[PDB]
Design a protein around this ligand. Sequence first.
Ligand SMILES: CC(=O)N1CC[C@H]2CC[C@@H](C(=O)N[C@@H](CCC(N)=O)C(=O)NC(c3ccccc3)c3ccccc3)N2C(=O)[C@@H](NC(=O)c2cc3cc(C(F)(F)P(=O)(O)O)ccc3[nH]2)C1
Length: 522
Amino acid sequence: VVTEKQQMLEQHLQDVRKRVQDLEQKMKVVENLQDDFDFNYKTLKNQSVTRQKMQQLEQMLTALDQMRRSIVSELAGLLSAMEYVQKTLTDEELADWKRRQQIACIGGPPNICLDRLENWITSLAESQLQTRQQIKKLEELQQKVSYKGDPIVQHRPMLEERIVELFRNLMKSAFVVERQPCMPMHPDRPLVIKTGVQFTTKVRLLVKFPELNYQLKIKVCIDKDRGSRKFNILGTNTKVMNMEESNNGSLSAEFKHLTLREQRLIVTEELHLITFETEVYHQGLKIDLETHSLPVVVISNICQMPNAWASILWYNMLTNNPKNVNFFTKPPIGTWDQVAEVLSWQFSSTTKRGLSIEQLTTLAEKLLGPGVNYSGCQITWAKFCKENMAGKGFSFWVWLDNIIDLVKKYILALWNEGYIMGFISKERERAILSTKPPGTFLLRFSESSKEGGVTFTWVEKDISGKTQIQSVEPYTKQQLNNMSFAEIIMGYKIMDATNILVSPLVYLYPDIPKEEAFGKYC
Ligand SMILES: CC(=O)N1CC[C@H]2CC[C@@H](C(=O)N[C@@H](CCC(N)=O)C(=O)NC(c3ccccc3)c3ccccc3)N2C(=O)[C@@H](NC(=O)c2cc3cc(C(F)(F)P(=O)(O)O)ccc3[nH]2)C1
């Protein structure tokens, strides 16, 4: 959906193109008038007819001055308009995409499409090129014909400085990281790179100039410019930028043959920047392009992956700054609503279902204790990942990451259909089951299991009539590799008072008969 701010920008660029094209027509007229004055001056050098020719030359030069004064001020007004539209395009519209990329990297909505920004940047770049050529023409014209108080002599140096500054800054802004450094075997976990593992990245120049095809050599490196680990990028660290049919004519450079090796604070919290460099030589201008990736965590073993991903989650959730390498020296605090958004993204990016309101509320209570409104609550790096949970030998994130993995690899189909209540407190599960008939059950995750465990809580009535709520010992990942959770639910039997094996499970919460819900999976 196109915004009001974006539609106003589309018209502002079209108005710039119209102004640029109007000045081109004025440039033609001023050149023809000067060419006529130059010709008539150099020629014809009854004797009072020479006095009439002199009056014609004076009138032509005064008309030349007025046309020059007009063009100069028309160009000054065009540059001011270009400056405003560029600030909206680069400092606002481009920055939003950069933030949208940070969010998409975590597991947020993938709205990071460059096609609209490439079209806007190219349009502004083509208009600025014609303007730079018009200012070059004024220099050419002045050399041939000039006079005391010439508007070109006094205002062209400023006009030239302004367009050159505009074009350089637009070229520098257009050099972006389209696809952040990521390991192909871990696509859902970018910005985490293990040493010795082949990794890919992609860069794009949003100024769609066919002149630049096969002309830009992109150099990639790591740790350019206390006691921090230094690394080197090995493999093919130079790529020539080219226009592809696959990119739809876009200038890009994809690096697929990269690896990190240590050169000759905690590892999961140490951040590094992967830098891209090139030089553009366009019609007399040397523009030095330099862009960098979002901070990367460099790991040595794949066991470090969970804690490394949490550092990326914290960074991209809390800051919009793309180069804060010292972020974890004093990490910022997050709100519950900020954290809850990220936690639901961990599930919606890997599965067809994110986290529900009830699941997020029980997750809020696990970290902050009892309450009703968690919107005014705060979660620190220590409560999330750095330190172990209260009364437990593992952190909240490690416990949660093992659940995400359990869902993704062992109980995906059940999670995707909504048969997993997942996160429900001991008090709340007893409450919602108390009303329901005997044999009603819900599926949830273990809180004491570090590696991840799945359980089912059911309700029944004793001889006395008192309602009893019990859970089964959590089924481990090893057990889920032999039998599916669905087969375990159906096959579960208990020893009755009559000493007969019976299934204590009849309806899945709220009233779904077990065979209707789990029969299709066994
Ligand atoms: C007390 C009661 O009414 N129960 C019935 C009896 C007991 C004793 C046997 C056990 C049971 O049913 N075991 C399962 C296997 C479970 C597993 N994880 O592998 C079972 O099917 N047992 C069979 C059997 C038969 C042959 C060989 C092996 C096992 C069985 C069937 C019939 C009779 C006896 C045994 N069976 C049970 O799990 C009973 N419950 C528990 O022991 C238990 C529940 C629980 C919940 C959590 C948590 F919620 F997730 P958290 O957030 O981490 O705190 C943590 C630890 C927990 N322990 C349920």
